[PDB]
Amino acid sequence: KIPNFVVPGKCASVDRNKLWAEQTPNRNSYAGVWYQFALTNNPYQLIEKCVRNEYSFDGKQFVIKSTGIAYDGNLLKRNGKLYPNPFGEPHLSIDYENSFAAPLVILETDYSNYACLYSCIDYNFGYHSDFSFIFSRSANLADQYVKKCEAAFKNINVDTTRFVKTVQGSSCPYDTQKTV
Amino acid sequence: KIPNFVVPGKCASVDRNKLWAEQTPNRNSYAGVWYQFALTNNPYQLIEKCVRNEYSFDGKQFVIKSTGIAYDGNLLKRNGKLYPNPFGEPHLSIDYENSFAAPLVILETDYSNYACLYSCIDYNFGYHSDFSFIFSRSANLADQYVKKCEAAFKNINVDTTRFVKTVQGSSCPYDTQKTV
Asked: Domains, chain A, ranges and CATH?
């Protein structure tokens, strides 16, 4: 009787201090292309299949070009930005044109194979909503790496049975997508 | 479709460019104290009663100190900011500590009595959610000004029967609230 991404209780502690300090020297290694391997039910994401996110780092933020196939079957490009939280909180803000901005934590990454991403918001009625993602440097992602993200999300009490796989691979027009 | 703030169709077009041209030279007149007179159902507002928003303008953004009574009956302060949309869109972003940032349109204001505020977000399933507010320079607001916001919201097809009045006036400890 309520959506599965509206969950009782408060957002979990995920130790952002530690993660922030690991990640600030490594921003250039996080740039380039990342493919969405899987995500939990998200009513905001407008790209359904072939989700490809290209990041450029200018020294203070990332510029993002997100592309793929929209829910109506058309090619779509979205312009985004990733920048430090404006209040000086140890996490990033992910912001998209014609949308809202939300906190984004890099729960775990090795830069060259995978990244595990997390967003959460507390409501005023004793629930939270959270949104989790698994990113890969390739269309595919080996089980050894999926399992690293599974452990990280279990560690903060996210039910990993909520993940759904995203369409990627040879059926995707990536070369067209990268041209906008 | 189930909560009353989940509504069919796309977010309204609200003629943001005309509003931005009117409002941008008058930022200084929008500063000072605004009381929340009424709002449509909002799951993000942590302050239930006696909502008092103090705005300071620095030429580039506003800094906000919001105070009042929380849903558990205790006093609460929240820190906020209002700044131009980072992509250069003709609207502001309203950003709060430990929360997200959303678009914020001023649909109508006279600076000295009232303001009518609007935020909207689109879902990938073809619905939207919007969040509306009536602000006053005083704890009460005269009917003529209430009626002006009702017409501005009807003009963009927001259902104004969704507004609920906020507790204000003599039962509010405003002088305590401003000690922060």
From this structure: 1-180 (2.40.128.20)
